[PDB]
């Protein structure tokens, strides 16, 4: 996260680190949606162009964390993956359309002051909250700038951007399964996700019921925090038929 600040303790209790076993390194962010299910970006797990194709036994999920590198004994909990489920129409070839995947943990994780699930939006929350100008919050342990790394979990609040402006920022084709977010140049505040933040949550706090909803998944951008560019997020609500479908069947 570029131009963010340190998270408060327990600020983002749904944050998950996807951690590679060998070499031991940060793979991506992710989020906890129940005691056994974790949400992330498909391209955290599968992306042929960069020869990424992670199997269950390659990775671990670290929940309850604040410090990036330390083992937070008797705070964090580390979970093994039972199974990965990638959206069957995830378009890695062109534009990261439907950049979404689920991971079922081997055992349920115990909730705690530091570990707690985020809500998924329903159609009404989406329609209420996913509006140009409305801010969400993006958290992660990714780079502090494009071209270094945080001691602790970083947070930034960013406005959702009008769809034409998102389109006009890029040569990539933007689908209804994505929204972008970020300050414009003339807004003179900044902030963005960056490398290692992919997979992590874009959350909003509903003013109607005072709960947090994951509206987005950190997906992609062209550089980090550049003037005139924005971050692109998976639209969680548009893909919730699939989420429900996976969770109901498995």
């Amino acid at each position: 996260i570029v131009e963010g600040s340190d998270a408060e303790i327990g600020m983002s209790p749904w944050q998950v680190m996807l951690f590679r076993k060998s070499p031991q390194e940060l793979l991506c962010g992710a989020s906890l949606i129940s005691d056994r299910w974790v949400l992330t970006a498909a391209h955290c797990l599968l992306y042929p162009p960069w020869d990424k194709n992670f199997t269950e036994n390659d990775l671990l999920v670290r929940i309850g964390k604040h410090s990036r590198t330390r083992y937070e004994r008797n705070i964090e909990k580390i979970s093994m993956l039972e199974k990965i489920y990638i959206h069957p129409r995830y378009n890695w070839r062109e534009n990261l359309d439907r950049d979404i995947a689920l991971m079922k943990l081997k055992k349920p994780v115990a909730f705690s002051d530091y570990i707690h699930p985020v809500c998924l939006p329903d159609r009404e929350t989406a329609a209420s909250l996913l509006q140009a100008g409305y801010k969400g919050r993006v958290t992660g342990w990714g780079n502090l700038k494009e071209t270094g790394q945080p001691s602790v979990l970083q947070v930034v609040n960013l406005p959702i951007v009008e769809r034409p402006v998102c389109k006009d920022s890029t040569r990539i084709r933007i689908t209804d399964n994505m929204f972008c977010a970020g300050y414009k140049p003339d807004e003179g505040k900044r902030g963005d996700a960056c490398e290692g933040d992919s997979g992590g949550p874009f959350v909003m706090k509903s003013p109607f019921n005072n709960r947090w909803y994951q509206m987005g998944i950190v997906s992609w951008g062209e550089g980090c925090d550049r003037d005139g560019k924005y971050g692109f997020y998976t639209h969680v609500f548009r893909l919730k038929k699939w989420i429900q479908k996976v969770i109901d069947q498995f």
Partner: peptide
């Protein structure tokens, strides 16, 4: 060792 060692039970 950029990351601190995880307990071996998780590996």
């Amino acid at each position: 060792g950029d990351f601190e060692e995880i307990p071996e039970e998780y590996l």
